[PDB]
């Protein structure tokens, strides 16, 4: 049917069969990544060719492969062997995580470190984290995970309350060897528990909260067809799901009278990095690329009705591949519902005597994922007026350490002896723009202050200026909140009735970007995070700001390599990459479980319509 439909279990099993048939999926092989590819530019739904891209790992140590298969045709389009030391290791396999604690449990260096702290190895949990790229030459070409220890006093104990500082181990998860065990010294292991369900800590629960019932007597206002095609209050789009990116929105368009007008061809969070700011050798290598290294979509939670998603909810249960190519469904992994959004427009006119009030609503598409101690909610919103917005919600348990006696400039104290290293959560939203079609351009708009004098005698005038970004070399921009800087994406060949190119304006939150020193490993690997906005010429192999292979990969791929091409982006098929994130200085209020904090961005129509598109909304 629609070439943008979600991958089905049958297609995944067929990809497995095709790879097996081609001799690419024997018993030593593991699927590190599997996802359907988007239709090519100009397909137009004419003859379907559902293609899947797969990253295949080999547990025996043989070189991995990147393969594209046509599930429709039963063929292997391409299969290439990867030199990982050069182009990057494949994403971490869920199976490699447990390996770390298992191997360390019998390592004498690890056991000696634990004994020095009087810790029973059977109660020491180990957080198996991505390794990054540092000074360890022996790691080049190997799949390494670094382990940090946490004591779990009993089965239901929250280990995060008991970090074991001064200790870290590096593990080769393929050869199953502990390569290094570093012990910088013993630190008291924080003693207080962080069991948020322990009545001793919570105290009696509140009996003061009365129920809030949200229902839709006649059902929702949106329709779902072809499994994932949504139609809602003039909007039209397809909800896709990729194991790496999570929820992806395709073909976002608005029905303006007689015509379906495209706005965004594809919107996704193409990368998210969590860099830690504690200079201690125990954690100075810590940087999670949840999307690129871990694949956020595979850890999507099954959302429960009532608590996760309240109201009249329509669920999608995406299917992904397990490590052997078998299909696996994430039951109720995606929530879809519409919610009241206060007042849309209101005016009580004295002269006419007409009082007018209209209510707003927004379509919500979301999912929630869990990566170790953190849990993240990804929310996309569509409003009646044409506004498009994204919001990330960060919660879970803060990553802990010991709090240094005598304080710290890079760690905050949460409880007696318990510290929380400073860090950031930075996202990259990749927006493949299609404002009224693919001929688009981007202008940076700044508010312009004017000097009092001739032509502005009262010194009250203020204006604005727009600078077209013509080539990729001048398309890497920074925020300027002071001058109200925004970026407008327009179609120079599609004009509204006032003869102005139709457009959409991107409003950023202007939060701090990557703080790390520019010469650090993280500044190079997460180069995209150092600038607020990047614009590139569309290319089918430029999917992530960090490249296809992020795990233990140095700089050399991603955005900095794409924009160097210096392609024409003035009235062309373009892609906007917006960096936005939160800078965290954990508070006592964030312990033992942190309340949701948020960050995001939105785009509002800018002369896209000929007048307000909500005049036809009825009084409710």
């Amino acid at each position: 049917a629609s070439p943008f439909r979600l991958a089905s279990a049958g297609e995944i099993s067929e990809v497995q069969g095709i790879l097996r048939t081609a001799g690419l999926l024997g018993p030593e092989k593991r699927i590190a990544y599997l996802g359907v590819l988007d239709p090519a530019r100009g397909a137009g739904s004419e003859a379907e060719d559902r293609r899947f891209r797969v990253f295949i790992h080999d547990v025996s140590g043989a070189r991995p492969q990147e393969v594209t298969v046509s599930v429709t045709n039963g063929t292997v389009i391409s299969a290439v062997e990867l030199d990982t030391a050069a182009t990057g290791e494949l994403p971490v396999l869920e199976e490699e995580f447990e390996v770390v604690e298992q191997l360390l449990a019998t390592d004498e260096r690890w056991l000696k470190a634990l004994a020095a702290r009087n810790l029973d190895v059977s109660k020491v949990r180990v957080a198996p984290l991505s390794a990054g790229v540092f000074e360890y030459a022996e790691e080049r070409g190997r799949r390494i995970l670094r382990g940090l220890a946490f004591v779990q006093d009993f089965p239901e104990d929250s280990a995060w309350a008991h970090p074991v500082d001064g200790l870290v181990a590096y593990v080769d998860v393929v050869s199953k060897e502990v390569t290094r065990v570093i012990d910088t010294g013993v630190f008291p292991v924080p003693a207080e528990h962080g069991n948020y369900t322990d009545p001793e800590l919570t105290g009696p629960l509140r009996t003061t909260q009365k129920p809030i019932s949200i229902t839709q007597p006649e059902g929702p206002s949106f329709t779902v067809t072809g499994g994932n095609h949504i139609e809602w209050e003039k909007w039209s789009l397809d909800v896709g799901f990729d194991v790496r990116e999570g929820v992806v929105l395709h073909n976002i368009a608005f029905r303006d009278g007689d015509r379906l007008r495209p706005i965004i061809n594809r919107a996704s969070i193409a990368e998210m990095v969590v860099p830690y700011g504690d200079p201690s050798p125990i954690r100075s290598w810590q940087n999670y690329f949840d999307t690129g290294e871990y694949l956020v979509g595979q850890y999507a939670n099954s959302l429960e009705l009532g608590c996760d998603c309240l109201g009249d909810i329509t669920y999608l249960s995406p299917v992904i591949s397990d490590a052997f190519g078998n299909p696996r469904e994430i039951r109720n992994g995606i929530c879809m519902h519409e919610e009241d959004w206060g007042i849309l427009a209101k005016h009580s006119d004295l002269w006419s005597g007409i009082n007018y009030t209209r209510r707003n609503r927004r379509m919500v598409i979301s999912f929630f994922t869990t990566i170790g101690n953190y849990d993240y909610g990804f929310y996309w919103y569509l409003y009646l007026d044409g506004t498009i917005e994204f919001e990330a919600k960060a919660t879970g348990v803060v990553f802990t350490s010991a709090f240094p006696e005598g304080g710290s400039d890079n760690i905050s104290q949460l409880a007696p002896g318990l510290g929380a290293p400073f860090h950031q959560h930075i996202f990259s939203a990749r927006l493949d723009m299609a404002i009224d079609g693919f001929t688009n351009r981007v202008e940076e708009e700044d508010v312009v202050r004017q000097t009092m004098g001739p032509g502005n005698e009262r010194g009250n005038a203020f204006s604005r200026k727009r600078t077209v970004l013509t080539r990729e070399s001048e398309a890497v921009r920074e925020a300027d909140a002071r001058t109200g800087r925004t970026w407008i994406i327009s179609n120079p060949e599609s004009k509204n009735r006032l003869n102005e190119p139709v457009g959409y304006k991107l409003h950023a939150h202007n939060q701090p970007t990557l703080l790390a020193d520019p010469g650090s490993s993280i500044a190079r690997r997460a180069a995209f995070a150092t600038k607020d906005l990047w614009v590139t010429r569309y290319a089918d192999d430029e999917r992530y700001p960090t490249g296809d292979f992020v795990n233990q990969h140095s700089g050399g791929a991603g955005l900095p390599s794409y924009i160097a091409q210096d392609r024409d982006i003035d009235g062309q098929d373009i892609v906007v990459w917006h960096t936005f994130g939160l800078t965290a200085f954990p508070r006592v209020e964030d312990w033992p479980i942190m309340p949701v904090d948020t960050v995001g961005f939105k785009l509002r129509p800018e002369g896209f319509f000929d007048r307000s598109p909500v005049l036809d909304v009825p009084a409710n």
Copy 2:
């Protein structure tokens, strides 16, 4: 009852009686402002002296007076004559607004201007706008209103669609004379109508919206006692209402276990200015001080259930005085309700096997006001986790002009020949802080980047720095979104369990502040708007950032005068004044009626609690 209870119709009638009796309310007198006075500092004497402040205007031209009465004692405590040329004119009376159109209708200069444009005088509405202080010496000491014309084709027609550019009149509303009639030239009067309820313009109304029902089967979780005292999920406060400021929050406190801990003594929007950036002499004098000159609370709308406020709503019908001292009730002028706010905290822990999810909710207190063409919603929110937030919603009809032939650097085109001059909506939130009591201080916190080198070999470290504002001469601060600048209000004598001064952190949106040239009249009169944050030592007579009498005041009043005192603010009774606003370049989408746009700020606990204050919230 409480000293913070809302004024009763009876108390207002009592002030009228007291004034009449003292001979201060003769036939030529008009009450330009009347409001209850807040209890003085340390008034734990239960004497209860309910005092009201009144500004009395004299239509015969006699000097106005500021009178303070005690309704408890039935006496006049004070009555001072005002020298308006020195201290500013009194707020514009709603009755003086009519005067402008009426006087102009028989003025020959005005009729001559309309005749040249072939406009029927009976169809020309005149917007009676505040005058400000410019180069007109003959205006000092006089109550002037400037008028802009708009054509209304029929009774139910939206006149805003038909501005009459190149024409402006100045009127002395006391002597009832037209002082000037400037006609810079003829501009075509925009022809299209902007009647948003006209089927010809709206088209067939949508039939796609299905109902969203929000109910509370057991009633709300908040309690209202003493008419305006609110208790909700640990929060405690008193909702006041003033004709100038609108909704005012008093004694915001949080019950932390055994004790009621104060956070903010008084919160209000103490001023709101709308400066226009069109250098045309027809409008270069235009700056509305909605709060100071017009009094936003007096124009509060009567909210309708289901339309304006959805769900289980509890209303407050505040009483204000009319121009003669008679009490007038604003029926359903304040909405109070609690609403679901998605996920509060969530974590699915692999090691403990515990999956935890909790919902968030916020208590909302709001009102909506209409000032001419604009309608504004003021919303205060209290969250479960201790966060306090304010949000202003701007809607209504855009103030129009002609769109110049050849375009404009200071006006945008909305419809053929129809222009929208650029402007800003800037607010000032006055927060009389009481973080665990009145001994408070403020620190400006900036993110600090670190250089790679000794102690930071991997170049990953980042920190934060805090600078205490010790005196008022160093308490006028600007935003710095780039370094994640925020301001923390703490109590240096109240420490949490980790022995750190308890505090709250103010997160601003970092929108542009006043754009006008620094030497302009508006920069002087609305100096508060040129900077993001001001901190002053509390004083009962420093109520507004622009002073007590904003109308036609020459400049320098309010904040710049207060801080010039250079008082000690390091661990003293202090007040934080936060400037925040929207900079507008009206779009075609804002015509014929604009969709809501928003701006605000929020404060989050910063080591105020000893751990998360929401561990006792039960499961859904």
